[PDB]
């Protein structure tokens, strides 16, 4: 609670993930226009353009509430302040400001991550399965985004541990690894499921997103989510958090009793495996049958692993 040295390495680790994530996106997008792949390049740059814009809009609202140049005064201006004090922390109630301001930045990175880690991983992995082998540049973004997803998720768990003392049993290295592999495996199963459908009909998957997106948006209304003050920001916050629910569940408002997660996943298990039954019972000549078996194997085994990890975490801590 005093912003020890140990979590300082956790904070500084962000940039060597963040700036590498940022430089990977810009170096990769121009490469697509350099090789002629205009569609992927412009669309992968759309995420980073929208990714930094969404957090900046939240950044301005948070900065204005706590308080042309201000337009570009976003995450970089916020991030420099904490390390300016953080460097003094290594040098030697500033502790209250340091911990509260850092954990505020951490959450904004999560929405910056899961709006750039998960949805952007789709395009690259969709452009890797299609072309077979891919190259080094695409492997860079996939690994760093996986690192970004891994780093942000565990960082959120640390924030949950320190924000409130209710989860005192969360202490230990085992909860860190179990919940981390919960995202990395459950997402991978659902991502690989969306990718497989994406080859069949692009339009159906995109329209399927709207139905799932609006359900998450409506789900914000029923829970009466409230974290921003501006009425326009309130509309935006339910939009962005609703989009995340399509990829994974996050227990909005932290006041539930495991009931909504069971409903969200009891349809996930039937939805994901139900898709596999469609392909197995109704074979498709479009997809090569040689490599379709390991993909069909890894989509179900990873999902089986994901629900298994859930029992360990909730069944012994929650």
């Amino acid at each position: 609670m005093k912003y020890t040295i140990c979590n300082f390495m956790m904070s500084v680790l962000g940039i060597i993930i963040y700036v590498t994530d940022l430089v990977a996106d810009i170096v990769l997008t121009v490469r697509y226009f350099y090789d002629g792949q205009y569609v992927f390049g412009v669309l992968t740059l759309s995420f980073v353009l929208c990714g930094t814009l969404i957090v900046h809009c939240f950044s301005y609202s948070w900065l204005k509430d706590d308080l042309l140049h201000c337009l570009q005064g976003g995450v970089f201006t916020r991030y420099w302040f904490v390390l300016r004090t953080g460097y003094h922390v290594v040098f030697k109630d500033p502790h209250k400001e340091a911990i509260d301001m850092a954990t505020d930045l951490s959450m904004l990175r999560l929405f910056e991550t899961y709006l750039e880690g998960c949805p952007q991983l789709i395009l690259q992995l969709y452009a890797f399965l299609e072309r077979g082998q891919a190259n080094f540049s695409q492997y860079m973004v996939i690994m760093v985004s996986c690192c970004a997803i891994s780093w942000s998720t565990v960082d959120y768990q640390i924030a949950l541990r320190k924000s409130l003392p209710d989860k005192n049993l969360l202490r230990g290295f085992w909860p860190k690894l179990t919940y981390l592999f919960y995202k990395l495996f459950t997402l991978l199963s659902w991502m690989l499921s969306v990718v497989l459908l994406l080859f069949v009909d692009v339009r159906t998957v995109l329209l399927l997103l709207l139905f799932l997106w609006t359900v998450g948006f409506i789900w914000a209304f029923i829970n009466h989510t409230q974290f921003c003050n501006s009425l326009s920001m309130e509309f935006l916050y339910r939009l962005v958090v609703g989009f995340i629910l399509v990829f994974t569940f996050f227990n909005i408002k932290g006041q539930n009793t495991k009931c909504p997660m069971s409903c969200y996943y009891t349809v996930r298990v039937l939805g994901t495996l139900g898709i596999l039954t469609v392909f197995w019972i109704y074979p498709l000549s479009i997809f090569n049958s040689d490599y379709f078996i390991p993909i069909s194997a890894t989509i179900v085994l990873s999902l089986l692993f994901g629900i298994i990890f859930l029992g360990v975490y909730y069944g012994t801590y929650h």
Partner: nanobody
Amino acid sequence: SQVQLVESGGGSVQAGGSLRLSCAASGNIADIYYLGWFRQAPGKEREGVAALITYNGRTYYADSVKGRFTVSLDNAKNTVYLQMNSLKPEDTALYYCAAAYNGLIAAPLKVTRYWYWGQGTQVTVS
């Protein structure tokens, strides 16, 4: 690139005649599953015309050119050959040959499927 594809045999030939093309893959082609050909002329995008599977040899074709193209592979020279008979005026286009590593999608006619390409040769029909 690990390998370089070389295109040759292009030239000028009268309508209804015959002409042969060769595409040579210099290097390691052990992991190459699909390789084929394309047609490209100004005013239109690339579309697949012919392709084959290195493992078996089943020559997938296009309905527009089905029953006409003659695509054969010779592993002795590590190359592929293409044969024309009774040309049509719209055949005038750039012919490129390209390969692709084995993946998941099985449709070697899509332009975005193949990984790396070659320079190509100009061919015209009179």
